[PDB]
Design a binder for this molecule. Structure first.
Ligand SMILES: Nc1ncnc2c1ncn2[C@@H]1O[C@H](COP(=O)(O)OP(=O)(O)O)[C@@H](O)[C@H]1O
Ligand SMILES: CCn1nc(C(=O)Nc2cccc(NS(C)(=O)=O)c2)cc1C
Ligand SMILES: [Mg+2]
Length: 861
């Protein structure tokens, strides 16, 4: 229930808009006969592709003249025209001397031989040599991840077959691929570069071309499969029990490879779960069990956690209201006062003080869901002097901090000092800490539930499974009889699911859909039906629909020249098309910069409620987080000119996370590299200088293209922090955003329209990373449906605009004209440098309506 926002654009512009759509051969659809029935201004996009069938990804064993990682030959170098025998012998002789000379490596080998998996080495190597596929089931902390790959390599080194061994290991997470590669490197007295290289998204330290272990993510591997798995002996799919969507999709591919090429060796590695599902899938492959030192863990629940602490809190069916009558009268009362949706931060402090009163030295492992709640818990404790450097050592563990800090969890602490690890679900199965005796469990999980109908990326904190709680408890009993503190009532444990819902059921498939087509694996639905647990129908339909809109797929659901580029780009297909459109407007670098910076957390550091002057000053008068992001990036790139220390002193002074800006940059260069290879010229991807205050037409175009990329994320500002969503529901501007004002203040915007990055609903709807746009930019790129009565126009059944019917039908025309050019450009990206004279004015007219002045707006007020 809002007024129609008027648009005071010049008559000069209206002529120019009408002039070009006439030249483009696009008639304006006339006003309706009566205003009660509106007519849509939406123009349908302006070929018969051959039907695909069943096809398996090809395989070939390791060679002596082939580098499997670079996927090319070895003409130059010492291992160029070497014999398989010369190599295998040299690689052994190299290892023989290293094991005798280095005494600090002998000390490391002596630790490797104590790990439970060691005694099974004989069985594992035998199982793999005989059977194509094998499952290596076993408890977390036995060393199946770190050792099994080495055993397989050493078995080929020591037996003089080292030239016939190249191992691929597929970790589900990003940090796990690096962490393990850096660990397995140290365990051979080397650095990653030599024998144990890695390759994650926008970061890779490739191994040597023979007798090597590549620790990559599944997504990285799938993108490099265009050719096929050429020059690889073993494929170790690690942490299958996590049920990562890409892991599940990979197992569908590998099953086809085992069937057609039974010489290859797959090695699935699972935790203590029901592996019968995977076993059956891979033709009842052997399940090599792995066990060792275990300890009985005395697990407690919220009833017991208030019983032995005498705790009292501050001022579906709620399970805290239920309580055993056997438990104390006050215990039952204290618990019922506590909310279930918020994790009890005060109770955790009381449990750390109970651990003290036992007088049994050991480290504490606190399982929280998000960094937001880990950063919360860390503050709470360090505010209390009792938890000081002399007495306590608190260490945060999540996949978004320096690897230096992630390694400090393993470092033994001074005697008397307690080590409390505020970790995520990373320390559940993927990695094991050795010092842990006591374990506190929130019994919560941070899952990315994406609904398509309203584009809601809800990071909901939902309850964990019985399998989660069972394996979180397991971490306690590795050193001694530990204690596990579950922060959920004995009633709530009953109303938990046996297992978690696999990602395959509750994730979008449009990224996997492209991969299927790119790898020529046939039909999207046809393939995904063969998955160990196929995805829901509606998710496949959604994915297929989502891709046909982008023109990534045709009517026959075959890969278009456009879609092929999107499949080769490791980003959201929509942000992939945005980048291509950037290359046409010669702002490709600026757009690549933005696209990249969505793969890492905002480089801005939090220092209170809202950002200070220094952080806001990057935003300028554009009222855009994305322009602030380019502004810091431009200012940071100039701070690198004066060497490495000048870079750090800038980052320090400006309160920026240097680690991010470098990873964001390295990503941008790789995004550029793929567009170049796809055909796009160098001249449209040059680091063009701009200003975030003065009139800049190139920056106007970047905000326009940005509106395209984030759609359907767009909102209307009413007052203060309150904004209206697409569905017509109220929402809050994120406290992080520059457009967020000070507590109870009036921010005066020259336009109420804002496209944004993430739509989050933790409690209420919060719009993060926002960018101001004009009514013209809204109609052009940030809207699909546009109806008109003659005076008013309706944009996706919300936001009414009192604007000329013609101008609206012209702007909606430019979109369809632009859409058509994207198709023509993707057939041959070279044509960007010499576009049609008619099409060069079409882009100039988009550049025109992109300007603030085009909607009668002046930012310098
Ligand atoms: N970075 C590391 N620092 C110290 N110990 C480590 C590290 N990585 C692994 N370990 C040790 O290796 C053993 C288990 O290794 P891992 O391969 O992660 O086990 P699994 O995959 O079977 O759970 C444990 O003793 C653990 O402490
Ligand atoms: C070209 C340099 N480069 N290489 C990689 C990479 O990770 N390659 C890789 C990964 C896993 C397996 C294989 N081999 S395969 C497909 O199974 O044949 C190859 C990343 C970068 C930048
Ligand atoms: Mg593991």
């Amino acid at each position: 229930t809002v007024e129609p926002y008027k648009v005071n654009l010049s008559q000069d512009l209206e002529h120019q808009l009408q002039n070009i759509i006439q030249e483009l051969n696009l008639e304006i659809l006339p006003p309706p006969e009566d205003p009660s029935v509106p007519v849509a201004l939406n123009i349908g996009k302006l070929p018969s592709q051959r039907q695909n069938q069943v096809g398996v990804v090809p395989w070939s064993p390791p060679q002596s003249n082939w580098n499997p990682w670079t996927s090319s030959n070895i003409d130059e170098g010492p291992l160029a025209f070497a014999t398989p025998e010369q190599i295998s012998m040299d690689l052994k002789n190299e290892l023989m001397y290293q094991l005798e000379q280095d005494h600090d490596l002998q000390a490391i080998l002596q630790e490797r031989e104590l790990l439970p998996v060691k005694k099974f080495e004989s069985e594992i190597l035998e199982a793999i040599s005989q059977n194509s596929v094998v499952i290596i089931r076993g408890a977390t902390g036995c060393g199946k991840t770190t050792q099994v790959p080495q055993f397989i390599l050493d078995d080929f080194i020591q037996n003089d077959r080292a030239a016939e061994c190249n191992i691929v290991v597929t970790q589900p997470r990003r940090i796990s691929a690096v962490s393990v590669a850096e660990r397995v490197a140290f365990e051979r007295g080397e650095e990653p570069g030599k024998s144990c290289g890695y390759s994650v998204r926008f970061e890779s330290i490739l191994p040597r071309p023979h007798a090597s272990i590549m620790f990559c993510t599944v997504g990285v591997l799938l993108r490099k499969l265009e050719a096929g798995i050429r020059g690889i002996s073993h494929v170790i799919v690690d942490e299958i029990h996590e049920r990562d969507i890409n892991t599940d999709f990979l197992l569908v591919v590998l099953r086809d490879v085992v069937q057609a090429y039974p010489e290859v060796r797959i090695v699935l590695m699972s935790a203590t779960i029901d592996t019968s599902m995977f076993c059956e899938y891979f033709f009842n492959c052997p399940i090599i069990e792995v066990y060792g030192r275990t300890y009985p863990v005395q697990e407690y629940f919220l009833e017991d956690c208030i019983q032995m602490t005498h705790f009292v809190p501050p001022p579906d069916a709620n399970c805290n209201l239920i309580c055993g009558d056997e438990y104390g009268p006050e215990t039952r009362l204290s618990m019922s006062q506590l909310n279930e949706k918020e994790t009890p931060f005060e109770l955790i402090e009381a449990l750390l003080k109970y651990i003290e009163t036992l007088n049994v030295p050991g480290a504490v492992l606190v399982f929280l869901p998000g960094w937001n709640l880990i950063y919360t818990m860390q503050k709470h404790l360090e505010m209390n002097p009792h938890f000081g450097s002399h007495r306590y050592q608190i260490l945060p563990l999540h996949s978004q901090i320096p690897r230096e800090e992630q390694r400090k969890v393993f470092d033994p602490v001074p005697v008397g000092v307690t080590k409390v690890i505020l970790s995520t679900n990373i320390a559940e199965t993927s990695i094991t800490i050795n010092d842990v005796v006591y374990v506190i469990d929130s019994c919560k999980q941070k899952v990315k539930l994406f609904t398509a109908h309203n584009n809601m990326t809800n990071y909901a904190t939902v309850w964990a499974s019985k399998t989660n709680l069972e394996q979180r408890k397991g971490r306690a009993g590795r050193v001694r009889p530990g204690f596990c503190f579950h922060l959920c009532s004995r009633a709530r444990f009953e109303r938990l699911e046996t297992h978690m819902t696999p990602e395959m059921f509750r994730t979008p498939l449009h990224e996997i859909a492209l991969s299927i087509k790119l790898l020529r694996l046939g039909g999207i639905g046809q393939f995904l039906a063969k998955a160990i647990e196929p995805p829901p129908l509606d998710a496949v339909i959604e994915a297929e629909h989502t891709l046909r809109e982008l023109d990534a797929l045709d009517a026959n659901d075959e890969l278009t020249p456009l879609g092929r580029i999107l499949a080769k780009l490791p980003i959201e297909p929509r942000f992939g098309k945005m980048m291509i459109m950037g290359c046409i407007f010669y702002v490709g670098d600026a757009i690549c910069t933005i696209a990249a910076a969505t793969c890492f957390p905002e480089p801005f550091i939090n220092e209170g409620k809202r950002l200070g002057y220094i952080h806001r000053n990057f935003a300028g008068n554009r009222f855009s987080d994305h322009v602030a992001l380019l502004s810091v990036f431009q200012a940071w790139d100039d701070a690198r000119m004066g060497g490495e220390e000048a870079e750090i002193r800038f980052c320090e002074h400006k309160r920026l996370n240097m680690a991010t800006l470098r990873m964001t940059w390295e990503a941008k260069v790789q995004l550029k590299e793929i567009l170049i290879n796809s055909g796009f010229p160098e001249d449209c991807l040059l680091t063009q200088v701009f200003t975030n205050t003065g009139p800049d037409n190139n920056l106007d175009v970047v905000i326009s293209l940005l509106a395209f990329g984030v759609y359907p994320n767009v909102c209307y500002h009413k007052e203060k922090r309150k904004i209206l969503t697409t569905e017509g529901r109220n929402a809050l501007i994120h406290k992080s955003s520059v457009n967020c004002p000070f507590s109870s203040q009036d921010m005066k915007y020259p336009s109420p329209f804002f496209v944004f990055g993430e739509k989050i609903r933790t409690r209420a709807i919060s719009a993060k990373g926002m960018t101001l746009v004009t009514p013209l930019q809204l109609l052009l790129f940030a809207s699909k449906k546009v109806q008109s009565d003659g005076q008013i126009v309706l944009v996706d059944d919300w936001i009414k605009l009192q604007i000329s019917h013609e101008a609206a039908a012209c702007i909606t025309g430019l979109r369809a004209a632009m859409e058509a050019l994207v198709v023509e450009v993707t057939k041959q990206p070279a044509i960007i440098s010499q576009l049609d004279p008619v099409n060069e004015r079409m882009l100039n007219m988009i550049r025109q309506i992109s300007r603030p002045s085009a909607a009668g707006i002046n930012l310098m007020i």
